Design a protein around this ligand. Structure first.
Ligand SMILES: OC[C@H](Cc1ccc(I)cc1)Nc1ncnc2[nH]ccc12
Ligand SMILES: [Cl-]
Length: 167
């Protein structure tokens, strides 16, 4: 039993809700919140910009030190950093950004990072400003993640289509 509330159950391990991940993380304070990151950990817009703003830029400060030490992530890769005031940990995961011409096949690799954590609050990878088809992202999530994932979906209208078309 966990403290997530109001989610629709899609499969044995995937749950979905129309919600603002910033507000959800502040309420639940989950062990792991997933950020829709880029390889440079520049949290400018989308989920990343919103999560970073909610940390008063502490996420960006920590991320800049991470990159200065380690260099950029790989597309499809991840790193674990602090969750600041939002969660215990933040798993920064880089899905492919179609608006940069990146290979959508890397979306499965991106979701594989979730399997290293028993329970996660997460957005749909490569959706929103990353330019992939969200119906595809949900399908890859369900077919790749085996741990317990609570998906927040920003747009109330978007959410209804994913549910109604969910196979
Ligand atoms: O897949 C991630 C999703 C992308 C998306 C945005 C808008 C439309 I229209 C269609 C897709 N963005 C978010 N999901 C959950 N919480 C969020 N907080 C801030 C942004 C955000
Ligand atoms: Cl977005």
């Amino acid at each position: 039993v966990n403290s997530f509330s109001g989610y629709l159950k899609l499969t044995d391990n995937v749950y979905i809700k129309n919600a603002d991940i910033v507000e959800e993380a502040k309420k639940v304070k989950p062990t792991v919140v997933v950020n829709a990151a880029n390889v440079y950990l520049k949290h400018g817009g989308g989920v990343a910009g919103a999560l970073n703003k909610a940390t008063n830029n502490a996420m960006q400060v920590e991320s800049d030190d991470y990159i200065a030490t380690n260099g950029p992530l790989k597309v499809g890769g991840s790193c674990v950093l602090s969750g600041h005031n939002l969660a215990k940990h933040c798993l920064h995961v880089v899905g492919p950004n179609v608006n940069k011409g990146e290979d959508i096949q890397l979306l499965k690799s991106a979701y594989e990072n979730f399997n290293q954590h028993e329970v996660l609050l997460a957005p749909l990878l490569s959706a929103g400003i990353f330019g992939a088809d969200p119906i595809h992202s949900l399908r890859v999530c369900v077919d790749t993640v085996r741990t317990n994932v609570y998906l927040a979906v920003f747009d109330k209208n978007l959410y209804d289509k994913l549910v109604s078309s969910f196979l």
